[PDB]
UniProtKB/Swiss-Prot annotation:
Ranges where the EngB-type G domain occurs: 22-186
Lineage: Bacteria, Bacillati, Bacillota, Bacilli, Bacillales
Disulfide bonds: none
Name used for this protein in its record: Probable GTP-binding protein EngB
Organism: Bacillus subtilis (strain 168)
Residues binding GTP, per UniProt: 30-37, 66-69, 133-136, 165-167
Miscellaneous comment as given in the Swiss-Prot or TrEMBL entry: Estimated to be present at 1000 copies per cell.
Length: 186
């Protein structure tokens, strides 16, 4: 998978605004927006391409759907409910959705917010690709230890992949693309 084309398509809040075409969709979720944008840019060899669902068309073959971060400590109950109607409407009605990539940090245990998001996604039976980032900051000899902390914290389902990733060395980029293709062609 070589990304020869990527552009933003729309920032939508309701189904009437989701793009047409029936191309498969991969949504991306993370506790933080900055980290999430960073991951998306590294997947498509860009630095600047990445409350609304932001759709991006990639190689005219799929859309990435950027879900606003789920870190709610400082978000009003009201905005939380609105985020809830927005994401739940998308997940339950979007036929195109094939998997969600959930982004977490390899360096430390996932937060309860990451755990709750993972639980919420599995309740709906959506395949999840868990990406543990910042792998370049951890010595290789400790990768397995850090992976295990992520896996055991989230209690990853045996059918879901855990991929260690670095936006700097591009470690896990081919693999992430591989799992994305597996989900889009099922």
């Amino acid at each position: 998978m070589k990304v020869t084309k990527s552009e933003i398509v729309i920032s939508a809040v309701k189904p009437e605004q989701y793009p047409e075409g029936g191309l498969p969709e991969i949504a991306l979720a993370g506790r933080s927006n900055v980290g999430k944008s960073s991951f998306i840019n590294s997947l498509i060899n860009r630095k600047n391409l990445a409350q609304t669902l932001n759709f991006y068309i990639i190689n005219d073959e799929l859309h990435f759907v950027d879900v606003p971060g789920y870190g709610f400590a400082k978000v009003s109950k009201s905005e939380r409910e609105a985020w809830g109607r927005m994401i739940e409407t998308y997940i339950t009605t979007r036929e195109e959705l094939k998997a969600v990539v959930q982004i977490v940090d390899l360096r430390h245990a996932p937060s309860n917010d990451d755990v709750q998001m993972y639980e919420f996604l599995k309740y709906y039976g959506i395949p999840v690709i868990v990406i543990a980032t910042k792998a370049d900051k951890i010595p290789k000899g400790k990768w397995d230890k850090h992976a295990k902390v992520v896996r055991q914290t989230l209690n990853i389902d045996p059918e879901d992949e855990l991929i260690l990733f670095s936006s700097e060395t591009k470690k896990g980029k081919d693999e992430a693309w591989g799992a994305i293709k597996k989900m889009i062609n099922r």
